[PDB]
Design a protein around this ligand. Structure first.
Ligand SMILES: Nc1ncnc2c1ncn2[C@@H]1O[C@H](COP(=O)(O)OP(=O)(O)OP(O)(O)=S)[C@@H](O)[C@H]1O
Ligand SMILES: Nc1ncnc2c1ncn2[C@@H]1O[C@H](COP(=O)(O)OP(=O)(O)OP(O)(O)=S)[C@@H](O)[C@H]1O
Lengths: 394, 741
């Protein structure tokens, strides 16, 4: 099974052409004329079914008229063809019926999935949109749900009416025929040239430490810690043993005057994939995950737990004090990063979330209790602080 | 004759296969296996099975494909099997019937040469090479011989299937019967033998017509490799007339069968089909339960196959054994630091807290199934809570174990419900039957489980434990159905003491939250307390910084070789080749150990605050000592093998008498007096023992054995060292000990 890989921008650099083929565009950007164009789109995979064998050349043996007839696989709706056209039994008043034979025919893997937007490509308005993909040929099983990936192929609606009524119209479903895949996050380009510019510009550490939150002045140290968080980027998958989360879990403490919610807006706007929420904004099951045992294929659907959305991003959290400690279990689960296991309602499986958690809390007594020691103001049981790495009471 | 569809010619295959069925011997198998030799000097195995079946009329011949493989000039067939089952099975049955005929024309009387030949013969080739579960199943192997494992979810009730029609006796009054030999059923237009009604409406009597059993068995494979995100998959199965009902719900069967692929219809009115075929597995053989309960049977002849299966246990269950592997095993068993070594060899990345590792190891080998005809269900395995100061490796030890075992099911607490913990039943209204679903505990049937935040678990939950942990059954009784699904499984829970650390001013069984019933339920409780040592602290810090030194760090601890992979096969050999029998001497020291445990626990104010030693302490001691003896490949429990069991149970409790809150901030005055009186007595002996020289061991047997339990004898070492400083005696070579002039 042959496929095509889109050219890099190197050729468009030297020879500008219809470069739209290799330009990664969102699914929102799919214009009515773009239907049929080899298009590379990026996002998040979801609901990828399991491998299903689909026939390609349907065979038909008669067992009486011998002639192995071969028909071509039409749109998914097809017909087992009728009495043979073989001449062995023909030219008489007799005709032996044919029937298929799986060995005689030929099959190939087939899979479906859907893609959603990066959440920094959707306006502050409408809902993100999905998009079907039919993975074909040997490219099967090379995919997974939740990976940043540039997928490329053709964009076609196939003709088929649901109710099979009289009026057909065109219910324009779609699919990106998987012609190539680029799973990013396992550049020597202009971006790296500007990176060299940056490394040469000096003070880059304290440079970013200043340019972070470039609307507010003061409390430089906490911005330093936020820099350390957003960079993160360490880990120790020790191999043949215990993994070690190389992510950061920094927490705050203070009063409205600190404007920490502004700092959070800042950071998880600055972080790609970043997400914001509040302590009471999402219930326990709301924030972790909600699974539905899909009855159609009786499979597992994950409905966007705040955390799983937060994978490979920083989760901003406010009002973490009022988060209903019965719900503190999920977060507490998060210290043990990239593993959220759920065993309820007939489903007992895990879903990993590579996440770093940023929290914003309040002293229980309002502003502060001078008469009382720290960690009284901070009601958090030490089994939570110990999961945090840095605490910044202000 | 070459086949138009397989190009696998018959005559050569049948010819080689014939003398294959006559040249077969146990030894071929042994040479490939490399195991130590007799099998009554390797009698002809196939004629053995064939005679036995002919006398028993089973007409079903189980077969391990690896046997046929291990014989010269048959590997051709061995692969064509994997590649052309639909016809190699046919030629196999042909050869089977034909060799039956040759055998009976050689063997005077059996079935009069005809009753045998009339009835068909089917073959049961199993263990053709364990495929890689579901997610590997390639649309390239649509017609091959797959092996699958995993429990079953639901079994459709027995479904009949037409095989021979019986058409209505017309007014012509001569009913006509005919088979089908395909999905088509032809009714002759004309009536019966005489054309009394040439135009005729022949009908069919769908009660006297024969039938065939077709049972559909859904299947949920084991979570051996399911990475994340997706629930383990499912592959519907069909079974045909002999293996039917060999697999009730809940069982943990294994299957070897051919893959298939069939289209579906959408409107079902027009003949038009749909692409993207659906797939199932036409089973051929079913390894029964992969268990050893043997309470009662389930089905017909199939149990004879089970008996033919269970006897070959050794190689088939180890799935790998060589006396170079077995030699390595016995060699490791010989090593002295074993119990220490293997401990760290579970989680090498884990630091000095070894006793936790020890208890975990003993959980892996858990117990032996003592099956009584009266009583029964004595929870053959154990269960280990562990608690302690936050950030003390507990959760990571759990990860580590769950990765170690080949059946683990990780699971969190407070993100799970009673249904998640113990499968939930459903009266399916489709066929009005009992389906079971997603028992986290049932997935762990055999092998360990893990549970975190065990405290944070809800009180509505943490109640199914109260049943499963001590009976390994779950008795569900809701609106539709009452039943008891047995889930044998050794739970292994983490914990967190209330608040966020100890309160050594608080009683211990209050510092732990769990009620005393459920607590005593736990076979063994650990208290992993965090210390301010500053002596281990820098050692731990180095023990982390070193793993950070490399990029791909391995062997984080001291560089002593330990078999990260070998130990798993070691475990899966130990738990299945040795069954410790508790010798008499063990009984005494076990009884006294229990008595001492309980009398110590006795108090008037021990009622509300302490943990009381109860019969489950004895259950713990026995089920745990026999596991220790299973380790080291010991066939029978010694006496000096329950002592460390007692030590482990005392890991939690060592330091309080009437009130809890151990405290115990670790040379005492009473230790002074002990050394002093020992010095007195030993000086008196050695001055009464005129032969002034005697070994330390001889001296011990002279004194420390005259009466009740022996002493440390390294305190004796300090005593004699004092007598060297004071110079009242002289060791005078290790062999003896003399006094001073
Ligand atoms: N260094 C600063 N620079 C600019 N504005 C600041 C600074 N410190 C405080 N503010 C202002 O303080 C205001 C208060 O912001 P809020 O979001 O209400 O505080 P906060 O983040 O909610 O703190 P919490 O969450 O209640 S403890 C913001 O609107 C900022 O404009
Ligand atoms: N002695 C030790 N050996 C190895 N790792 C250790 C040790 N002490 C602490 N750690 C590390 O410290 C972290 C503690 O993780 P865990 O103790 O498993 O989590 P946890 O203790 O369950 O947290 P809680 O509060 O008890 S739920 C992990 O990164 C461990 O690897």
């Amino acid at each position: 099974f042959l496929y095509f890989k889109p050219l890099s921008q190197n050729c468009a650099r030297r020879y500008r052409k219809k470069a739209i083929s290799s330009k990664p565009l969102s699914v929102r950007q799919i214009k009515g004329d773009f239907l049929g164009q080899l298009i590379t789109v990026r996002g998040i995979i979801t609901r990828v079914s399991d491998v299903k064998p689909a026939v390609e050349v349907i065979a038909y043996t008669c067992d009486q008229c011998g002639y192995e007839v071969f028909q071509e696989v039409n749109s998914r709706t097809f017909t087992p063809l009728s009495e043979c056209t073989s001449e062995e039994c023909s030219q008489n008043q007799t005709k032996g019926q044919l029937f298929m034979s799986t060995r005689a025919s030929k099959f190939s893997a087939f899979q479906e999935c859907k893609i959603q937007e990066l959440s920094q490509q959707v306006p502050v308005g409408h809902i993100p949109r999905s998009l079907n993909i039919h993975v074909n040929g040997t490219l099967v099983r090379s995919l997974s749900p939740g990976d940043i990936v540039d997928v490329t192929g053709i964009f076609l609606p196939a003709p088929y009416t649901g109710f099979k009524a009289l009026k057909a119209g065109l219910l324009t479903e779609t699919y990106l025929e998987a012609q190539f895949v680029r799973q990013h996050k396992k550049l020597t380009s202009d971006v790296e040239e500007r990176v060299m510019e940056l490394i040469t510009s000096g003070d880059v550490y304290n440079r970013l430490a200043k340019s972070i939150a470039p609307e507010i002045y003061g409390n430089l140290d906490v911005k330093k810690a936020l820099l350390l968080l957003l960079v993160g980027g360490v880990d120790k998958r020790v191999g043949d043993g215990m993994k070690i989360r190389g992510d950061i879990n920094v927490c705050l403490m203070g009063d409205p005057g600190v404007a920490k919610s502004q700092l959070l807006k800042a950071i998880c706007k600055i972080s790609p994939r970043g997400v914001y929420t509040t302590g009471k904004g999402s219930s326990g099951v709301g924030l972790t995950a909600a699974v539905m045992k899909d009855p159609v294929t009786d499979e597992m659907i994950l409905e966007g737990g705040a955390l799983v959305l937060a994978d490979n991003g920083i989760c901003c959290i406010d009002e973490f004090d009022k988060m209903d400690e019965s719900d503190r279990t999920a977060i507490h689960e998060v210290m043990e990063q990239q593993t959220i296991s759920i065993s309820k309602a007939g489903i007992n499986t895990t879903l990993n979330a590579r996440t770093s958690i940023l929290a914003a809390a309040n002293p229980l007594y309002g502003r502060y209790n001078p008469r009382l020691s720290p960690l009284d103001n901070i009601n958090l049981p030490a089994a939570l602080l110990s999961r945090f790495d840095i605490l910044f009471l202000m | 004759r070459i086949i138009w569809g397989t190009n696998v010619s018959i005559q050569e295959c049948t010819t080689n296969f014939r003398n294959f069925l006559m040249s077969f011997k146990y030894k071929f198998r042994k040479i490939l296996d490399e195991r130590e030799e007799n099998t009554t000097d390797e009698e002809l195995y196939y004629i053995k099975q064939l005679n036995e079946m002919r006398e028993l009329g089973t007409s079903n011949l189980n077969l391990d494909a690896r046997n046929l493989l291990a014989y010269k000039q048959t590997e051709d067939l061995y692969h064509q099997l994997l590649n052309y089952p639909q016809e190699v099975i046919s030629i196999m049955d042909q050869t089977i019937k034909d060799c039956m005929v040759s055998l009976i024309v050689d063997n005077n009387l059996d079935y009069d040469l005809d009753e045998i030949e009339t009835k068909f013969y089917k073959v049961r080739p199993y263990n053709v090479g364990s495929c890689k579960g579901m997610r590997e199943l390639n649309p390239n192997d649509i017609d091959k011989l797959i092996n699958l494992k995993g429990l079953v979810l639901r079994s459709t009730p027995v479904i009949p299937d037409m095989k021979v029609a019986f058409f209505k006796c017309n007014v012509c009054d001569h009913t006509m019967a005919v088979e089908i030999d395909r999905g088509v059923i032809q009714e002759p237009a004309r009536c019966e033998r005489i054309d009394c009604n040439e135009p005729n409406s022949m009908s069919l009597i769908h009660n006297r017509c024969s039938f065939a059993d077709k049972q559909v068995i859904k299947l949920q494979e084991t979570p051996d490799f399911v990475p994340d995100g997706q629930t383990p998959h499912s592959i519907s199965l069909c079974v045909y007339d002999e293996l039917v009902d060999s697999c009730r719900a809940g069982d943990r069967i294994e299957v070897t069968g051919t893959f298939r692929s069939i289209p579906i219809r959408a409107n079902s009115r027009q003949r038009v089909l749909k692409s993207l075929y659906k797939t199932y597995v036409d089973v051929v053989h079913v390894k029964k339960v992969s268990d050893k309960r043997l309470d009662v049977d389930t089905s017909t002849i199939e149990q004879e196959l089970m008996q033919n299966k269970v006897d070959h246990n050794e190689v088939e269950e180890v799935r790998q054994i060589t006396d170079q592997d077995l030699a390595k095993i016995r060699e490791v068993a010989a090593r002295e630091d074993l119990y220490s070594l293997l401990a760290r060899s579970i989680a090498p990345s884990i630091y000095e807290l070894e006793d936790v590792k020890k208890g975990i190891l003993l959980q892996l080998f858990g117990g032996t199934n003592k099956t009584f005809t009266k009583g029964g269900r004595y929870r053959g395995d154990i269960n280990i809570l562990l608690c302690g100061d936050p950030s003390t490796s507990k959760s990571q030890i759990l990860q580590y174990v769950h990765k170690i075992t080949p059946r683990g099911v990780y699971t969190s607490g407070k993100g799970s419900s009673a249904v998640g913990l113990t499968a939930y039943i459903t009266r399916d209204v489709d066929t009005k039957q009992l389906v079971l679903e997603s028992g986290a505990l049932v997935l762990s049937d055999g092998g360990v489980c893990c549970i975190d935040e065990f405290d944070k678990m809800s009180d509505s939950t943490r109640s199914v434990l109260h049943e499963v942990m001590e009976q390994q059954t779950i008795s569900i009784a809701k609106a539709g159905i009452i039943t008891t699904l047995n889930a044998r499984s050794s739970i292994l829970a983490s914990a967190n003491p209330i608040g966020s650390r100890y309160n050594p001013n608080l009683p211990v069984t209050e510092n732990i939250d769990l009620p005393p019933p459920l607590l005593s339920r736990f076979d063994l409780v650990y208290l992993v307390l965090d210390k301010v040592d500053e002596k281990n602290d820098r050692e731990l810090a180095k023990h982390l910084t070193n793993l950070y030194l490399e990029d791909k760090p391995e062997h984080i601890s001291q560089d002593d070789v330990l078999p990260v992979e070998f130990l798993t096969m070691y475990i899966s050999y130990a738990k299945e080749h040795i069954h410790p029998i508790i010798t008499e001497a063990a009984k005494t020291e076990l009884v006294r150990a229990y008595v001492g445990m309980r009398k110590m626990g006795d108090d008037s104010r021990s009622d509300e605050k302490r943990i009381t030693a109860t019969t489950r302490q004895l259950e713990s001691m026995i089920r745990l000592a026999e596991a220790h003896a299973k380790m080291k490949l010991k066939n029978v429990v010694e006496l000096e093998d329950v002592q460390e069991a007692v030590r482990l149970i005392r890991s939690a409790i060592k330091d309080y008498a009437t009130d809890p809150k151990t405290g115990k901030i670790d040379k005492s005055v009473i230790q002074r007096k002990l050394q002093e009186d020992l010095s007195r007595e030993i000086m008196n002996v050695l001055k009464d023992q005129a032969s002034d020289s005697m070994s330390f061991n001889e001296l011990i047997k002279q004194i420390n054995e005259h009466s009740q339990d022996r002493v440390e004898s390294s305190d004796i070492q300090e005593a004699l060292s004092r007598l060297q400083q004071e110079d009242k005696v002289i060791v005078l070579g290790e062999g003896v000990r003399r006094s001073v002039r």
